[PDB]
Amino acid sequence: MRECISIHVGQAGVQIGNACWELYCLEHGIQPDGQMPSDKTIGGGDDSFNTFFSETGAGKHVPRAVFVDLEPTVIDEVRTGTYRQLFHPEQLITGKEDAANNYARGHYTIGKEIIDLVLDRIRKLADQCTGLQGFLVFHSFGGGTGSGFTSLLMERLSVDYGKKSKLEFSIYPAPQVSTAVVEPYNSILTTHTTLEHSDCAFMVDNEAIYDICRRNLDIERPTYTNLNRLISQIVSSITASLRFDGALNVDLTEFQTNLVPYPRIHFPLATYAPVISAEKAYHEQLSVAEITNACFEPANQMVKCDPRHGKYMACCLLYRGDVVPKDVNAAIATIKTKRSIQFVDWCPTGFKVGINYQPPTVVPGGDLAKVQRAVCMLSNTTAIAEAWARLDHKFDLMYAKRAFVHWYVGEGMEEGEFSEAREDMAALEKDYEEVGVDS
């Protein structure tokens, strides 16, 4: 058994982290007070769940997680919330004043003052690990902490643990729920600096999740709670293989080897189905064929973009619930002769498939209906570069006038880092065009 440490940085990373651990506890039968009746080996074990939960002599099951935010508002919700008893105070780290949506403020100014305290709390967790495999880092692109502090944290993690894998769950910015006009700057700055330090990153566009919540959950104006409960379902299906018995994606290294043939091109598209509202009493259960077909619908993707006009490098299907290999191969047969699924020449056309018999757990009283089967597809498609193009365009519009640049320079950042980050993204866009476009 190899342990995984989750790190939650800034408001988005913390609130999402809080939704995931809630869900993890429901899935493993852990109660708010930390106890697990199902667990028999008291005070320790080598079970699959132990990858995410350590144990105390008193039989408390404790998340291998640290929460970091530059202001205490959000993390204090955790300390006093439903799962207060789950975490230890050492895990929750708060600062005095936040990064004010300024990458440079979070990275340079405030980052410098708190980074050693953070790395040390992480070390305490690493020290209880017999065989740590690496880190899962949750954060927004757009916030000053989420963007600036995370990239410093990632740089230092590569130093203190150079062998370990690092995976990201990043919230890509959408104006519909956005809190700052400079988010594009923060996104490109953080992506540039983080790039070489992340083995695999799952981007979730708030726009996609927002719209899914509106059209499928009939939520008129989604809140962060609605968004986060949906995000945590997707996150759980992605991490479920590290927490449960199985043979696909059982260690963090597997994500890279299965999904990322070229190191920079490490942003797989997540697609999820089915999302059904818990308010619809009569609903007909979707089949393996149908939920699988839904994986090739832009309306269900974590980022809106069109894979028909890109090429695939890898594809993974993660099913939870009443699914057998026969139904999957049948679904894939029909779908293939019906849809535009072009793989790059230097990769095999195929799917790695995982099935977990426990159907998705939903939060009691949440917006999500319980369903008997669900799937999350992780596909590495060049079509996701559409999200980089949008982002880079917005950056260009503002940067051409040097709008808001002084806020960054004023925090000790050099202006050239803007052009440096933007050059890196331009190369990135070019790399995607090379692997995915003919002429």
Binding site: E155, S158, G246, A247, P348, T349, F351, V353
Partner: protein, 54 residues
């Protein structure tokens, strides 16, 4: 379609179906970056305090 690497346990199954064959900065360098930014912050503030002093 060929199904391979089929693995079964009580929790579930995994396998692979093929449809067609194919055809870092040191600790020192980072602290230097943080320190150089802090120095620029110190310099900008000293200029402000100089201006105010005049």
């Amino acid at each position: 379609m060929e199904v391979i690497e089929l693995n079964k346990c009580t929790s579930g199954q995994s396998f692979e179906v093929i449809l067609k064959p194919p055809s870092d900065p040191s600790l020192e360098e980072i602290q230097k970056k943080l320190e150089a930014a802090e120095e620029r912050r110190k310099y900008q503030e000293a200029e402000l305090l100089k201006h105010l002093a005049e």
